[PDB]
Design an enzyme around this catalytic site. Structure first.
Site, short mmCIF file in Angstrom:
data_model
loop_
_atom_site.label_atom_id
_atom_site.label_comp_id
_atom_site.label_asym_id
_atom_site.label_seq_id
_atom_site.Cartn_x
_atom_site.Cartn_y
_atom_site.Cartn_z
N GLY B 20 0.81 -1.20 0.00
CA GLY B 20 0.00 0.00 0.00
C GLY B 20 0.85 1.26 0.00
N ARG B 24 7.23 1.63 0.66
CA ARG B 24 7.51 0.22 0.86
C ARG B 24 7.86 -0.44 -0.46
NH1 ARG B 24 7.56 -0.63 5.96
NH2 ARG B 24 9.83 -0.86 5.69
N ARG B 43 1.97 10.47 -8.66
CA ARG B 43 1.31 11.03 -7.49
C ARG B 43 2.08 10.61 -6.25
NH1 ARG B 43 -4.47 12.39 -7.19
NH2 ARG B 43 -5.15 13.15 -9.25
N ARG B 87 -0.89 -8.48 -4.11
CA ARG B 87 -0.85 -7.45 -3.08
C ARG B 87 -0.08 -8.01 -1.89
NH1 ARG B 87 -2.42 -4.03 0.69
NH2 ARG B 87 -3.44 -5.00 2.51
N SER B 90 -0.47 -5.63 5.15
CA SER B 90 -0.66 -6.01 6.53
C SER B 90 -2.14 -5.96 6.87
CB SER B 90 0.09 -5.04 7.44
OG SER B 90 -0.48 -3.75 7.35
N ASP B 204 -1.62 -6.24 13.90
CA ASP B 204 -2.23 -5.98 15.20
C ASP B 204 -3.36 -6.95 15.47
OD1 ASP B 204 -4.91 -4.82 14.33
OD2 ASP B 204 -3.56 -3.40 13.33
N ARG B 213 9.29 -8.13 13.51
CA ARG B 213 8.24 -7.64 12.62
C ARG B 213 8.78 -7.50 11.20
NH1 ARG B 213 6.89 -2.41 15.33
NH2 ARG B 213 8.00 -3.32 17.12
N1 LIG Z 1 -13.05 11.69 -14.52
C1 LIG Z 1 -12.81 11.45 -13.23
N2 LIG Z 1 -13.46 10.44 -12.56
C2 LIG Z 1 -13.21 10.21 -11.25
N3 LIG Z 1 -12.34 10.86 -10.43
C3 LIG Z 1 -11.69 11.87 -11.10
C4 LIG Z 1 -11.88 12.18 -12.43
C5 LIG Z 1 -11.10 13.22 -12.81
C6 LIG Z 1 -10.38 13.59 -11.71
N4 LIG Z 1 -10.71 12.79 -10.62
C7 LIG Z 1 -10.14 12.89 -9.23
O1 LIG Z 1 -8.74 12.69 -9.34
C8 LIG Z 1 -8.40 11.45 -8.71
C9 LIG Z 1 -8.39 10.27 -9.71
O2 LIG Z 1 -7.95 10.67 -11.02
C10 LIG Z 1 -9.45 11.21 -7.62
O3 LIG Z 1 -9.00 11.51 -6.27
C11 LIG Z 1 -10.67 12.02 -8.08
O4 LIG Z 1 -11.19 12.91 -7.08
N1 LIG Z 2 -6.53 -3.29 11.57
C1 LIG Z 2 -6.55 -2.83 10.31
N2 LIG Z 2 -7.71 -2.35 9.74
C2 LIG Z 2 -7.70 -1.89 8.46
N3 LIG Z 2 -6.67 -1.83 7.59
C3 LIG Z 2 -5.51 -2.31 8.17
C4 LIG Z 2 -5.43 -2.80 9.46
C5 LIG Z 2 -4.16 -3.21 9.75
C6 LIG Z 2 -3.42 -2.99 8.63
N4 LIG Z 2 -4.21 -2.43 7.61
C7 LIG Z 2 -3.75 -2.05 6.24
O1 LIG Z 2 -3.01 -0.83 6.39
C8 LIG Z 2 -3.57 0.20 5.56
C9 LIG Z 2 -4.32 1.27 6.39
O2 LIG Z 2 -3.65 1.53 7.64
C10 LIG Z 2 -4.51 -0.46 4.55
O3 LIG Z 2 -4.02 -0.43 3.20
C11 LIG Z 2 -4.75 -1.87 5.09
O4 LIG Z 2 -4.48 -2.91 4.14
#
Ligand SMILES: Nc1ncnc2c1ccn2[C@@H]1O[C@H](CO)[C@@H](O)[C@H]1O
Ligand SMILES: Nc1ncnc2c1ccn2[C@@H]1O[C@H](CO)[C@@H](O)[C@H]1O
Ligand SMILES: Nc1ncnc2c1ccn2[C@@H]1O[C@H](CO)[C@@H](O)[C@H]1O
Ligand SMILES: Nc1ncnc2c1ccn2[C@@H]1O[C@H](CO)[C@@H](O)[C@H]1O
Ligand SMILES: Nc1ncnc2c1ccn2[C@@H]1O[C@H](CO)[C@@H](O)[C@H]1O
Ligand SMILES: Nc1ncnc2c1ccn2[C@@H]1O[C@H](CO)[C@@H](O)[C@H]1O
EC number: 2.4.2.1
Lengths: 237, 233, 231, 237, 231, 233
Positions: B20, B24, B43, B87, B90, B204, B213
């Site tokens: 994610g 990393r 980005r 993917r 964690s 966790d 870890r």
């Molecule tokens: N045509 C589209 N459809 C959906 N999301 C769009 C657009 C155009 C811009 N965004 C915004 O930019 C991020 C993904 O491109 C996203 O964070 C989103 O807010």
């Molecule tokens: N206890 C949790 N609940 C939800 N997301 C969790 C966890 C623990 C790890 N993650 C993962 O970490 C990212 C968000 O923190 C996310 O990308 C996710 O994969």
């Protein structure tokens, strides 16, 4: 320090602008803020705090999607004393008279996400912005001589929608721009008691053409930033 | 090529590991790949391509959330010829027998997003991983002498859930780990005809040292890279 | 004794094969099991217990529909110590290259039933089989020189769907075969903590070649997968 | 003449105030409009058209519930050339700091109705008012020296809800007042291309006390009417 | 012939009684019908046709669950010219004063199945019986000196519900008895244009006194209601 | 007593006829009741109480829509001791064999509102009328020598439906008439333990003179009043 933000109380201002792109955030900090200081970078989600005309402001990215900005906006509100959040993003246009680089102000935000339904007993929660914040943004615009349409945005979970027929529905009800987090930010604002507004720059047209990432993190998209920053100053009065 | 990845057909391998955190991804490329070059960063979402034991492989972050990893994995499948998505992240554990540092393999992933109902006429779509891919990881984990649990993951839309009630539900139906994108990636895989699998290490529990870890994180990755080798055969 | 199974703890093996057709449970007991003995007849739902290569095994039908298989499966798991359930049935294919008589192992099961949403607070619960059981079945087929397809199944609530447009959706997401209970059985397995698996032989695209062959092959695949599981 | 309104094009103004109670409508026509002329009465749903400070205005009831005002608002927009609709109703308060007779302006309206889901492919359509209309109403208030909170309303299908736990949810997300048609009027406004706003007077408190029908069709509830009428004049400029 | 009924047009009467238990279809043919003759056995689902006081009538089980009864009901109506379907079964009671052995006619059937929403564009479809058939049944019982209860039924998809809190909701809205198919049968009747009815005898609150009595009474009520219907 | 009815316990009979139009209620009281006095009018929703052939009976409008008739019928049941509610209105026909002026009796009513799912834990609640009440109307209609159809009605939330598609659906499942409150009233009846029934005359068709139209409206009412007499016995 929160799970996704390595900072302390005070590093952030009570008001922080939030674009989805962390690099646009750095650009904002560099181009509009003074004494810009980086306060976060945990997963590359750059956070900056400085001053715009004396006013102490912060600018940080929230990532793409509702579940992403939900994490950030939440930690900011509950752990860094943040009060107002102004999302400065981009969106796609669905109406024929909406042009690229047009600035849009979302007083409301429809969504296909289930988040608000989860927190509103499966009913319809109208995800709306803070009226005054919306008005500060309208006034700011008129004063900068920049145009801006006020209306409903549509926060989508899927950038690449398997259902294109939904664009006719969006267009019919005249949603101004398609983006991906406004409705989640408003829901968080309400759930944790904070105020928020979403301003967007039409980056592309669902029925036609588009821009480039570069243009998206630096070109124009200065209008919404100027509008955002100035409107804050209006709110201070 | 696309608004979220500034690379071109050929810059990525046909197998991409996806953590994610963009940071990393750089860590994986730097730690396990040879002659690795950065192939994207529009980005801040760093992406890399190198080789692991002569095999060409890529590593790129997908950001937090289904909506986010859906954009990238989708673009990778349809725009850069990617065949497999693995993917590597964690998750939080909900069951007691599931301990910290456990390597969970999501054969399936429950979720609370409408993303798959939207694409499946509001019916129940079972977001599953590719069988052979799950098997390659299970075998590769045995070789590395590391046991691994296989089961359901829950992909949450809200990391900070208002409905604390779901945790008991998840535990009742025995979901192994909780993360935020498995169901999103599996959905994309099914929709654009590709293969995917998500492996997680338990970070966790709802009820250890860094060196330990970090050792388990590397094992997960080794299991990931090694599974890709098994499948190649 | 349970509302729908007139038997006591110990009568069933910890593993139970389940055809939809009650008439096929008897056929299996006679054809593949050894020292079989009837253990149920409550509603014509014949159940038998015997051994396969020394391994104790039971056979009993579950009926058509999720509600049906759900009653039996639950009662077996919670009242007869059953730990594994292998469903052996038929299904229709929607995909162009999935042919008649093919064998498919349901790693997962999609459904239009509201059964799991009721269990999972109206969220998406991934009804999945037990991986080991999937692999065992897969390995069992390869030894038997059979090439099984592992993928998703669609457990339908309506054999005669009001809308046939859903069959396109199913193809779009590559479901291997359409049947009517896999997702119900998996749901019960998850709820009461037990392992389940569904194996189906494509009987149509939505005789001797069927019986002494495909159907028999599927039963052989199932029984042999159990033994591998025991390893 | 439409199925529920026996009138012709021209009998109604381009702007019509709409209370749920037809008798409050007559009261409005009698107390605030000049040369008030009754233009409808089909099912007792009194319709009136006159002038407020030269401005030609109409006032007509829409009945109780979303499916009721949906009928009326629709026929008005498609067959009588109406452009703006300002609902002048009452509502119940759920927040502790909200007092009877307090005026509320709904920029948004949540709902437990399925209407908007039916017209938005089962997604979340943010039922919002027209920004300018909302602002005209805010300005009007400040000028009349009357207080008014701007926010979300909740349009309920069941006045007597079998689920009281939903009030905690409403209160948590701070909905200002509970009424029964705002969300339906906004949905209609959008579906048929018209502009609308909902103004309400807290007639009772879900957690405490209430008023009387008489007080509801004549007492105070003059504040929202004055606000409504004046804001229209602001919109004319 | 149809996928689940090995028979041809003419084999079934325009009216069919349907118990859940296949074993009871045979009992009815022997006990109440005349000149009965088997017309089906496809899955142990025994169907019979005979006459009652000269009236031609058929008997055949439908199995447990909506999916099950839905397959048979549809095939009978669309392929065997059947015009009336009377379900005769059992159900559990939730209400304080609805006693064991009572007879209840389901004028309507509530359900947690998603079967009708799929048919009715996710809206609320009122699965109801045929009024005439309800009245006939009611009149039939009075003549037999039995006092039947006419009201709503709840067709459940899960015999073992994950949440028992719904039983309170059911009491709150006065449902008479809990069973598992009435709403499915009504749905099929509405879809293919035919009349249906469900009669149940309270077998529990969620022997001779059961058989040669209540169950027999319910069958008598059903058969006699048909004759009244013919009037 | 309540904010929508300014009467007191005793002002209404234990049986109330309810047309949608307040003006039609005055018409019924004036046309069929003797010594009838107005018992309410707080929102123009006229209500009357008189006697029909020595029987005490009330007539009051419920306005258009489920949300509207739900407020009144609910108040009548819990606040004024009403035992039976008999809605008497009109509906649109969708099936061809169903002709203009047909008197439809709704034994059940489908609907597109969430009102009953809200009270029935999101499950399917079958909004039905009271059996005996339906029967009294059927018998009373035979005596008046007027045939009457018994079946499902569809209670629409939107008179002007954006989803024109539902009409073919309604016809497919053979719903007799389309109106706007049957499911709402039945739901209240079930919830507060009362009895209700709605009778309709077909006013239009999706595919006649006033004197004939008015004659059938009066028949509906006569069938309503006469059914109440049958049940009394
Ligand atoms: N045509 C589209 N459809 C959906 N999301 C769009 C657009 C155009 C811009 N965004 C915004 O930019 C991020 C993904 O491109 C996203 O964070 C989103 O807010
Ligand atoms: N206890 C949790 N609940 C939800 N997301 C969790 C966890 C623990 C790890 N993650 C993962 O970490 C990212 C968000 O923190 C996310 O990308 C996710 O994969
Ligand atoms: N084409 C199909 N569509 C639906 N169900 C099908 C098939 C083919 C076989 N089956 C199985 O047989 C029973 C219903 O006929 C069910 O129990 C199911 O397992
Ligand atoms: N406490 C409440 N709950 C629901 N609706 C309420 C109130 C109070 C006022 N209203 C509004 O007045 C009419 C019903 O009383 C309706 O038209 C509605 O707008
Ligand atoms: N208490 C109960 N709950 C659910 N179903 C019940 C009962 C009692 C009887 N039945 C009927 O028997 C079958 C399932 O046991 C079903 O087919 C049903 O008709
Ligand atoms: N074709 C239709 N669609 C919807 N409602 C209809 C009709 C025909 C008559 N009604 C009834 O009249 C009132 C709304 O016009 C409502 O109270 C309703 O009962």
């Amino acid at each position: 320090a929160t799970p996704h933000i390595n900072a302390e109380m005070g590093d952030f201002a009570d008001v922080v602008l939030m674009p989805g792109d962390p690099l646009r955030a750095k650009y904002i900090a560099e181009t509009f803020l003074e004494d810009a200081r980086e306060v976060n970078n945990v997963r590359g989600m750059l956070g900056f705090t400085g001053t715009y005309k004396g006013r102490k402001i912060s600018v940080m990215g929230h990532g793409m999607g509702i579940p992403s900005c939900s994490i950030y906006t939440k930690e900011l509100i509950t752990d860094f004393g943040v009060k107002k959040i102004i999302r400065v993003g981009s969106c796609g246009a669905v109406l024929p008279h909406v042009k690229l680089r047009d600035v849009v102000i979302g007083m409301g935000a429809c969504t296909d996400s289930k988040v608000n339904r989860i927190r509103f007993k499966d009913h319809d929660f109208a995800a709306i912005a803070d009226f005054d914040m919306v008005r500060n943004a309208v006034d700011a615009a008129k004063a900068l001589g920049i145009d801006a349409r006020v209306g409903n945005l549509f926060s989508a979970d899927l950038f690449y929608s398997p259902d294109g027929e939904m664009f006719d529905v969006m267009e019919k009800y005249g949603i101004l721009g398609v983006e991906m987090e406004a409705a989640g930010i408003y829901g968080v604002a309400a759930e944790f008691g904070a105020k928020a507004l979403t301003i967007c720059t039409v980056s592309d047209h669902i029925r036609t053409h588009e821009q480039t990432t570069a243009a998206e993190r630096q070109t124009t998209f200065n209008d919404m930033i100027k509008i955002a920053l100035e409107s804050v100053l209006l709110g201070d009065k």
